[PDB]
Amino acid sequence: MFCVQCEQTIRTPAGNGCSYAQGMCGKTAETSDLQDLLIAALQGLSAWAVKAREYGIINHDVDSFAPRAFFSTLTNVNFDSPRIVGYAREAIALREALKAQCLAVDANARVDNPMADLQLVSDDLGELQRQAAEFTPNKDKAAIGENILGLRLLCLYGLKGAAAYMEHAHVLGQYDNDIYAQYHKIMAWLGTWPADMNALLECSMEIGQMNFKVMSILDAGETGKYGHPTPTQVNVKATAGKCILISGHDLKDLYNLLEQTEGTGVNVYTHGEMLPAHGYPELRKFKHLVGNYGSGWQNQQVEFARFPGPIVMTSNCIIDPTVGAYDDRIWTRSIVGWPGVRHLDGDDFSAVITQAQQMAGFPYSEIPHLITVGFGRQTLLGAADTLIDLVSREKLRHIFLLGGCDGARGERHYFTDFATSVPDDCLILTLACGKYRFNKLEFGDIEGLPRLVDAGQCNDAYSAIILAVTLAEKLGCGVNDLPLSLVLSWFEQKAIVILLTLLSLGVKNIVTGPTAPGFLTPDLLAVLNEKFGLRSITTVEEDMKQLLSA
Ligand code: SF4
């Protein structure tokens, strides 16, 4: 068992990632090995899906399936082993079903597909299954250059994050077929174990390109489904009676859970990456979504435990529910999976509504306290020519992007401290669950424009990127001539992929912490420090000064 995709892998002097028996995040050898097999099935599929060789044409099913499956191998998404084997099941079903369509035409020359992952068919039963040992991401650990492995992983791990966005784009109603072609090529090529440090870097930038396309399209879905987030204040206190809290990234599930509970008199609370839902007008319309509860995925355990009603996990950042003994009342949706905790497929929430009604709910409201959220792609560009004014009257000193995931380690204090200690004459543009790091602390404004400007969700770095571009557009300059640096936090594959696209956009002088990834060797991350000056955090006061100045 070996993977290292999260900011929280095993972290040791010798080596990088989690091997051993279990993950740090609760995945077992079983899963994390089975997940490897699913990735291999998946990669083969994608190689046959690259099979519109001249005009072999495309099946939306395969296209639209591949990300959704890959998404399950993601961190804190899925830890139920059967589910994962089953994703592999139907990957191969469609590789085979796919093969037939092309095979009625020219009998695939000499080789239908020259592929490592090939047909990759499999035998049955889980424990006795795990022959995925042949597929682990580092079977050639020392049989390939260690720096080649690092680029390789950051290429796959990265693409993973992109697929998450492809899906929770798709689901919100949008895809593109050229993107799908690019997905499959990249996945197909990653299938074939190959490692050429030149093309790994160069196909780690192209993932960046693609990820932007798809974040393009996913910000396209959110705006079109539920409006353009306009700036909006959210209560983070508890209120009144019975409640269901919904966590994760899928706005669809909240719009449904909202209609279904419409005047049922049970209330909706968001948590984690569901916060920025609140800014969306066709979603904030509801009088029952009361507030937003708790903070940061890193502590579901002790907070979900305290929340009266049931919890609905839309996607990602789920951990072991057994600890807080709330496993009866967590409902995994979509591709989220945890063994033995109820999975709610279908768009019928009434199961969990009635469950919410059985429970305590809240005993009162607390004296409320609101934060401000939903600086939309739209509403951010709204700000720009006033950002440029404020800067152009030495009112706005420089803009700071405190961003990316929350994790668990105390070393994350950095982000909180960084944020308060940003000087009183410059903005924060935050955008992720690490928003929760400094999010409820007091910030003030610069002439009305709030100093803490939430942009929404990890997936909304696309918003942040686009603000910068329109600032560079406007100030006749270039993206890092801009008076903004980026001090991003990170935890999983989506934030890897945002780093890729940020790098691919060519934004130089990024500051990931609170540590840098497990598969980036001091060599390699020094190569990134060659090409893009990407440096780690480690110190709040130093890094403040470095960044303010010319
Ligand atoms: S998800 Fe992260 S913590 Fe869990 S096994 Fe994989 S790398 Fe380790």
mmCIF file of N, CA and C in Angstrom, residues 6 8 23-27 75-79 247 271 296-304 311 313 315-327 330 332 336-339 341 407-408 491:
data_model
loop_
_atom_site.group_PDB
_atom_site.id
_atom_site.type_symbol
_atom_site.label_atom_id
_atom_site.label_comp_id
_atom_site.label_asym_id
_atom_site.label_seq_id
_atom_site.Cartn_x
_atom_site.Cartn_y
_atom_site.Cartn_z
ATOM 1 N N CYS A 6 -1.930 13.448 -0.148
ATOM 2 C CA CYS A 6 -2.529 14.477 0.695
ATOM 3 C C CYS A 6 -1.453 15.257 1.422
ATOM 4 N N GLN A 8 -1.195 15.378 4.319
ATOM 5 C CA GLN A 8 -1.083 14.828 5.663
ATOM 6 C C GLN A 8 -0.508 13.404 5.646
ATOM 7 N N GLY A 23 -3.828 4.344 6.074
ATOM 8 C CA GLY A 23 -3.560 5.744 5.838
ATOM 9 C C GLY A 23 -3.509 6.483 7.164
ATOM 10 N N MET A 24 -3.112 7.748 7.093
ATOM 11 C CA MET A 24 -3.270 8.623 8.237
ATOM 12 C C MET A 24 -4.728 9.058 8.337
ATOM 13 N N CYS A 25 -5.428 8.974 7.202
ATOM 14 C CA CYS A 25 -6.764 9.505 6.985
ATOM 15 C C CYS A 25 -7.765 8.352 7.019
ATOM 16 N N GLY A 26 -7.288 7.174 7.360
ATOM 17 C CA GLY A 26 -8.246 6.170 7.739
ATOM 18 C C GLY A 26 -8.417 5.144 6.635
ATOM 19 N N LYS A 27 -7.830 5.389 5.451
ATOM 20 C CA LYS A 27 -7.922 4.342 4.438
ATOM 21 C C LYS A 27 -6.987 3.190 4.814
ATOM 22 N N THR A 75 -8.887 11.891 -1.838
ATOM 23 C CA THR A 75 -8.639 11.831 -0.408
ATOM 24 C C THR A 75 -9.856 12.287 0.374
ATOM 25 N N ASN A 76 -10.190 11.523 1.427
ATOM 26 C CA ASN A 76 -11.331 11.858 2.262
ATOM 27 C C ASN A 76 -12.647 11.805 1.469
ATOM 28 N N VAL A 77 -12.640 11.261 0.237
ATOM 29 C CA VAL A 77 -13.853 11.046 -0.552
ATOM 30 C C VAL A 77 -14.452 9.681 -0.226
ATOM 31 N N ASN A 78 -13.664 8.624 -0.457
ATOM 32 C CA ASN A 78 -14.235 7.288 -0.498
ATOM 33 C C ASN A 78 -13.278 6.302 0.147
ATOM 34 N N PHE A 79 -13.833 5.526 1.094
ATOM 35 C CA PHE A 79 -13.094 4.545 1.870
ATOM 36 C C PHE A 79 -13.859 3.235 2.000
ATOM 37 N N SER A 247 -22.536 19.291 3.981
ATOM 38 C CA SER A 247 -21.141 19.672 3.892
ATOM 39 C C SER A 247 -20.650 19.240 2.518
ATOM 40 N N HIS A 271 -21.738 23.627 5.936
ATOM 41 C CA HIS A 271 -20.489 23.478 6.674
ATOM 42 C C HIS A 271 -19.361 23.127 5.729
ATOM 43 N N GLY A 296 -14.338 24.003 8.932
ATOM 44 C CA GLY A 296 -13.145 23.293 8.472
ATOM 45 C C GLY A 296 -13.275 21.766 8.506
ATOM 46 N N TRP A 297 -12.769 21.098 7.472
ATOM 47 C CA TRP A 297 -13.191 19.714 7.367
ATOM 48 C C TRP A 297 -12.462 18.970 8.460
ATOM 49 N N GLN A 298 -11.301 19.535 8.761
ATOM 50 C CA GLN A 298 -10.336 18.937 9.647
ATOM 51 C C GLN A 298 -10.983 18.539 10.988
ATOM 52 N N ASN A 299 -12.153 19.089 11.351
ATOM 53 C CA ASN A 299 -12.804 18.730 12.602
ATOM 54 C C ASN A 299 -14.274 18.383 12.439
ATOM 55 N N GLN A 300 -14.662 17.659 11.397
ATOM 56 C CA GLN A 300 -16.001 17.095 11.448
ATOM 57 C C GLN A 300 -16.234 16.392 12.790
ATOM 58 N N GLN A 301 -15.252 15.568 13.180
ATOM 59 C CA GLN A 301 -15.415 14.503 14.145
ATOM 60 C C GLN A 301 -16.147 14.976 15.396
ATOM 61 N N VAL A 302 -15.755 16.156 15.892
ATOM 62 C CA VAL A 302 -16.111 16.608 17.230
ATOM 63 C C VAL A 302 -17.233 17.635 17.126
ATOM 64 N N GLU A 303 -17.580 18.008 15.884
ATOM 65 C CA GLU A 303 -18.561 19.050 15.622
ATOM 66 C C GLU A 303 -19.809 18.412 15.044
ATOM 67 N N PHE A 304 -19.625 17.496 14.091
ATOM 68 C CA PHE A 304 -20.796 16.797 13.615
ATOM 69 C C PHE A 304 -21.427 16.089 14.801
ATOM 70 N N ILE A 311 -26.442 14.590 9.034
ATOM 71 C CA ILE A 311 -25.522 15.274 8.145
ATOM 72 C C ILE A 311 -25.469 14.600 6.783
ATOM 73 N N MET A 313 -23.276 14.366 3.391
ATOM 74 C CA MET A 313 -21.954 14.643 2.819
ATOM 75 C C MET A 313 -22.003 14.746 1.295
ATOM 76 N N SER A 315 -19.679 15.665 -0.803
ATOM 77 C CA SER A 315 -18.434 15.269 -1.467
ATOM 78 C C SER A 315 -17.185 15.820 -0.798
ATOM 79 N N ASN A 316 -16.211 14.920 -0.602
ATOM 80 C CA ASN A 316 -14.850 15.172 -0.149
ATOM 81 C C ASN A 316 -14.892 15.507 1.320
ATOM 82 N N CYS A 317 -13.703 15.522 1.930
ATOM 83 C CA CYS A 317 -13.518 15.862 3.333
ATOM 84 C C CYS A 317 -14.643 15.286 4.217
ATOM 85 N N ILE A 318 -14.736 13.944 4.153
ATOM 86 C CA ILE A 318 -15.415 13.055 5.081
ATOM 87 C C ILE A 318 -14.328 12.272 5.795
ATOM 88 N N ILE A 319 -14.416 12.192 7.113
ATOM 89 C CA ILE A 319 -13.546 11.205 7.729
ATOM 90 C C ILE A 319 -14.409 10.266 8.563
ATOM 91 N N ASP A 320 -13.701 9.297 9.160
ATOM 92 C CA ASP A 320 -14.246 8.262 10.016
ATOM 93 C C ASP A 320 -15.365 8.771 10.926
ATOM 94 N N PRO A 321 -16.636 8.465 10.587
ATOM 95 C CA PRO A 321 -17.783 8.929 11.364
ATOM 96 C C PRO A 321 -18.019 8.165 12.664
ATOM 97 N N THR A 322 -17.296 7.058 12.839
ATOM 98 C CA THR A 322 -17.591 6.170 13.948
ATOM 99 C C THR A 322 -17.153 6.821 15.253
ATOM 100 N N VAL A 323 -16.117 7.673 15.176
ATOM 101 C CA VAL A 323 -15.472 8.317 16.313
ATOM 102 C C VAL A 323 -16.442 9.196 17.089
ATOM 103 N N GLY A 324 -17.240 9.978 16.353
ATOM 104 C CA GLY A 324 -18.184 10.888 16.976
ATOM 105 C C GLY A 324 -19.549 10.253 17.248
ATOM 106 N N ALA A 325 -19.671 8.946 16.965
ATOM 107 C CA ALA A 325 -20.923 8.203 17.005
ATOM 108 C C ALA A 325 -22.089 9.037 16.456
ATOM 109 N N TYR A 326 -21.922 9.371 15.179
ATOM 110 C CA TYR A 326 -22.935 10.047 14.406
ATOM 111 C C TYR A 326 -23.098 9.270 13.096
ATOM 112 N N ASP A 327 -22.697 7.988 13.079
ATOM 113 C CA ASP A 327 -22.630 7.191 11.857
ATOM 114 C C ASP A 327 -24.019 6.790 11.364
ATOM 115 N N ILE A 330 -25.079 10.154 9.367
ATOM 116 C CA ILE A 330 -24.351 10.671 8.225
ATOM 117 C C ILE A 330 -24.862 9.908 7.010
ATOM 118 N N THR A 332 -23.835 9.572 3.024
ATOM 119 C CA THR A 332 -22.872 9.842 1.967
ATOM 120 C C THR A 332 -23.674 9.927 0.679
ATOM 121 N N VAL A 336 -18.955 9.906 -2.638
ATOM 122 C CA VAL A 336 -18.509 9.854 -1.253
ATOM 123 C C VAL A 336 -18.895 8.472 -0.726
ATOM 124 N N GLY A 337 -17.980 7.805 -0.016
ATOM 125 C CA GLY A 337 -18.348 6.538 0.590
ATOM 126 C C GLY A 337 -17.565 6.249 1.863
ATOM 127 N N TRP A 338 -18.298 5.789 2.889
ATOM 128 C CA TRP A 338 -17.679 5.298 4.106
ATOM 129 C C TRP A 338 -18.373 4.011 4.514
ATOM 130 N N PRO A 339 -17.650 2.891 4.802
ATOM 131 C CA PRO A 339 -18.256 1.562 4.918
ATOM 132 C C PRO A 339 -19.267 1.542 6.053
ATOM 133 N N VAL A 341 -21.850 3.404 6.706
ATOM 134 C CA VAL A 341 -22.625 4.621 6.829
ATOM 135 C C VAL A 341 -23.492 4.761 5.584
ATOM 136 N N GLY A 407 -6.034 21.863 7.021
ATOM 137 C CA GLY A 407 -5.571 20.557 7.466
ATOM 138 C C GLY A 407 -5.677 20.484 8.983
ATOM 139 N N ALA A 408 -4.820 19.688 9.616
ATOM 140 C CA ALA A 408 -5.047 19.440 11.029
ATOM 141 C C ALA A 408 -3.922 19.991 11.907
ATOM 142 N N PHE A 491 -4.479 20.839 0.867
ATOM 143 C CA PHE A 491 -4.569 19.517 1.470
ATOM 144 C C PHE A 491 -4.761 18.359 0.474
#
